[PDB]
Design an enzyme around this catalytic site. Structure first.
Site, PDB file in Angstrom:
ATOM      1  N   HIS A 177       0.822  -1.231   0.000  1.00 21.75           N
ATOM      2  CA  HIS A 177       0.000   0.000   0.000  1.00 21.75           C
ATOM      3  C   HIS A 177       0.853   1.278   0.000  1.00 21.75           C
ATOM      4  O   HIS A 177       0.328   2.321  -0.377  1.00 21.75           O
ATOM      5  CB  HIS A 177      -1.062  -0.111   1.103  1.00 21.75           C
ATOM      6  CG  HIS A 177      -0.657   0.292   2.476  1.00 21.75           C
ATOM      7  ND1 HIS A 177      -0.702  -0.588   3.526  1.00 21.75           N
ATOM      8  CD2 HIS A 177      -0.283   1.480   2.991  1.00 21.75           C
ATOM      9  CE1 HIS A 177      -0.340   0.029   4.626  1.00 21.75           C
ATOM     10  NE2 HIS A 177      -0.066   1.296   4.321  1.00 21.75           N
ATOM     11  N   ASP A 182       0.327  -7.824   0.770  1.00 19.28           N
ATOM     12  CA  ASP A 182       0.670  -6.425   1.016  1.00 19.28           C
ATOM     13  C   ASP A 182       2.164  -6.271   1.301  1.00 19.28           C
ATOM     14  O   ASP A 182       2.583  -5.751   2.334  1.00 19.28           O
ATOM     15  CB  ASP A 182      -0.171  -5.847   2.156  1.00 19.28           C
ATOM     16  CG  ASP A 182      -0.332  -4.343   2.054  1.00 19.28           C
ATOM     17  OD1 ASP A 182      -0.692  -3.852   0.963  1.00 19.28           O
ATOM     18  OD2 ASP A 182      -0.098  -3.653   3.067  1.00 19.28           O
ATOM     19  N   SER A 184       4.125   2.364   9.193  1.00 18.38           N
ATOM     20  CA  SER A 184       3.705   1.405   8.182  1.00 18.38           C
ATOM     21  C   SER A 184       4.857   1.106   7.232  1.00 18.38           C
ATOM     22  O   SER A 184       5.586   2.008   6.810  1.00 18.38           O
ATOM     23  CB  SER A 184       2.504   1.938   7.402  1.00 18.38           C
ATOM     24  OG  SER A 184       1.858   0.895   6.693  1.00 18.38           O
TER      25      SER A 184
END
Lengths: 296, 296, 296
Positions: free
Chosen positions: C45, C81, C162
């Site tokens: 992402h 991901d 992240s």
């Protein structure tokens, strides 16, 4: 006795409950005893209504023994969300030990200590997750929205520990909790409180610019939205839709860093402002003015 | 092996998964083994539907080995959000060690342990952020909303550890997790469970008052909204728009503290209730009635 | 120096800032240096837009010294991901030490480390709250929504960490943070990255089923919503409104566990699928197909 249990119990007598009540409302918060004469540091949003309408609010300080004493407001800085209160002739006060937030490092264990006798009072634990992080703060009533260069912590900051101290593992105050948590570093709180006590308030620089954050490949940073008339920026060459990338000796990533950088300037001494103007990099020479001329 | 890893692994065999399934729904939660005969303590919201519609729900207990055994409901207290279950003739049960929540202090490291084999199961860590904190709890189905004098923790309480034990650093149960986190203290859970086992349910005091929280300079506390007819408050002198500031030997800051204070009273013995009535401080003499007369 | 302070400072030179900027947008994230040749692992992402529109985005890697170097995308797995980047001929790289997520236990202290020089960068602390927990992940742009068998932690996972590493107390990477927090285990990240480097991408099994979670007393699990035409499930006997309770050698509690179980299968070898069909338990024999036939 637990390791955090020992630290919290050692600073509990330095944290106080701050209540301001009218006939229809009542605010509560936390504060810290930082001077034996009775000087108590909290944040500005805890007391905001009692200063905009002091004719109708009454501020009191409740200690960890339960003693309730009258309290008066020395000064308040909405731009750093800080405030100093004064209790008179209270004896045997347990003054907090003020540390050095310049020696605080990421991953350091911290305690966000609220006033024990408060209603929704909390003592939370976590680590320092970021240093010198600009965070925007919303003003309470008529008070202005500001941005502070803050210490970030994954200890929860809430109504129960707002205004209370952020405490290191030597039981020293390294910040003031402002209600994914943020605190005002103690070294800035020392500079602000020393002026709020002496002068009743504090003076910060201004350039007369409003900005909006921009993020792309040409020039990212703070895009000028409005330049006030007669302002130092107007008389320095700053135009609208300019992208400031550095104020003085600080790079600017967005509007939030821009607010903190302007307030790290020297009033009345020329300073450099880099700008990316239609793809042309232009440095400008701006003389910051004081936000309060008479108090300066 | 880690310090929290050791504590969690020592109590995992005492935490169980509690499932109740119908033909169209299924609830899951956590529970704690507190008696070798098979007595399992969870909270009331985990089992609420299986007690309001037992004709259609079936409650089962899954252990940490995977064994699924039938389970029956001994009693449930929606006013403390507690419940006791019973598994029959299950051998080699790993009973949890029950501590003393009166010795729990703020800043103490805790573990909110959920049932390992649960779906969204969680084991979270934090500290005790407050003691004897009234927190309102919303009832599940037809169940009533209540307020419990709770232990507050910055360990996360969620669907994955609700009903499970709050564990100290000696691997002892100090609370029951009720899904910024709150737990039911173990000393109250012991009193409630001892009565749910013997009598099938528990009896609490009532005065027949509804209140709303008030916060100002005249009188802050619990403002009476409605006084039931024939109630002990009605026959004690309590009027509406009165501000109760103390029930028995407990000061009342709001309606939430009022609920816990009424339930700390003695059924059938006169007790003092302070009230600020139109600026006049009036103490009253109220005889608490039982919420369930026949079970009393 | 603090205990977490020491661990975070030892891995800071292995975490990098990943920026992708166009003329109107700019994304930032974190990444981890896992190979001395310049291979950097982040999550999918963070880079999604720069791969769906590489004609207009430019990805760069900023190190903890401040050096900004060009970066190219080796491969990306939206179904886990994950993503691998490559910096060329950068010397004195501080490669991260990759641990074994199979030895991670619940209650283990962890650090979710973000890139220090990032904007909203964070380093958070907590414990492992669950192992092998399927969590659904929403795809960024045109990217598909997926479910990953994840490590759960009560350390906060956010935009600031992240793509960064989940770090144990030996300063070893045990997961990749994907933004009540979840991380991709390092052992799966090793398998995925080893294939993204060699082959440019990775191939996963497919059966052609869509499911919805069901929870009742008859059969709980994954209820089949649609079976694709010509699919292995269609040619295996799987019908719609069937409840899959086990894919291969893994029980299935809901649709989320179903996605992870299908992706733990062997492409092209028959596998057993249990189903509860109108109350009749039916096991079926399905031959998983590859999601990408030519790359397989």
């Amino acid at each position: 006795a637990g390791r955090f249990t020992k630290v919290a119990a050692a600073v509990a007598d330095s944290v106080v409950t701050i209540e301001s009540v009218s006939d229809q409302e009542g605010m509560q918060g936390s504060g810290v005893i930082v001077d034996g004469r009775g000087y108590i540091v909290t944040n500005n949003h805890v007391i905001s209504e009692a200063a905009n309408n002091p004719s109708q609010f009454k501020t009191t300080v409740v200690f960890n023994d339960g003693k309730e004493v009258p309290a008066n407001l020395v000064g308040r800085d909405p731009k750093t969300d800080l405030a100093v209160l004064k209790v008179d002739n209270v004896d045997n006060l347990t003054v907090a030990r003020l540390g050095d937030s310049s020696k605080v490092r990421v991953g350091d264990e911290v305690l966000a200590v609220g006033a024990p006798l408060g209603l929704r009072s909390t003592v939370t634990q976590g680590i320092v997750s970021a240093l010198h992080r600009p965070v925007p703060l919303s003003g309470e009533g008529s008070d202005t929205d500001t941005v502070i260069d803050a210490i970030q912590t994954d200890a929860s900051i809430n109504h129960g520990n707002s205004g209370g101290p952020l405490i290191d593992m030597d039981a020293q105050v390294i910040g003031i909790n402002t209600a994914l948590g943020f605190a005002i570093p103690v070294n800035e709180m020392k500079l602000v409180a020393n002026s709020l006590i002496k002068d009743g308030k504090i003076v910060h620089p201004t350039l007369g610019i409003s900005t909006r954050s921009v993020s792309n490949a040409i020039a990212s940073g703070a895009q000028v939205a409005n330049v006030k008339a007669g302002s130092p920026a107007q008389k320095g060459g700053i135009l609208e839709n300019d992208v400031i990338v550095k104020v003085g000796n600080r790079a600017v990533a967005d509007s939030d860093e821009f607010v903190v950088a302007v307030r790290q300037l020297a009033i009345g001494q020329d300073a450099p402002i880099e700008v990316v103007r239609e793809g042309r990099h232009v440095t400008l020479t701006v003389k910051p003015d004081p936000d309060s001329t008479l108090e300066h």
